[PDB]
Amino acid sequence: SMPDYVAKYPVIQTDDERERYKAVFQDQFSEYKELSAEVQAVLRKFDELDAVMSRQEHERISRIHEEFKKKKNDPTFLEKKERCDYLKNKLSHIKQRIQEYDKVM
Numbered sequence: 001s002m003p004d005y006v007a008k009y010p011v012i013q014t015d016d017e018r019e020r021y022k023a024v025f026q027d028q029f030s031e032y033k034e035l036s037a038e039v040q041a042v043l044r045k046f047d048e049l050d051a052v053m054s055r056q057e058h059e060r061i062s063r064i065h066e067e068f069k070k071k072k073n074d075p076t077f078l079e080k081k082e083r084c085d086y087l088k089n090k091l092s093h094i095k096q097r098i099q100e101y102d103k104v105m
Helices: 015-050 055-073 075-104
Strands: none
Touching: 015 055, 015 075, 055 075
C-alpha cells in the first residue's frame, strides 16, 4: 500500500520530468484533500466530545466513552488516517523535488 516515493521520484533533470511530477502532485493532492477533510472532521469531533464531561450519569458516560473510543480506533478510519499521513509526506517529497528544480533552473 505505500510505495517508496524517494526511489520513484529522484532529482528532476528535465522539464518533461518536472511536468510529470506536477501531474502526479495534482492527482494525489486532490485525493489527499478529500481524505484530510474526512480524517480531520473525525478527530475534531473527538476533542469536542471530551469537553462535555445520579448513577445514570455513570451509564451515559460509559455509553459515550465506548461509542467515542470505538470510532477513533475503527480500523477503516485508521487505514484512511494512515493513507492520509503517507500522502502528506509523499506530496511534500514531490513538492520539494519540483521547488528544487525550479530554483536551480
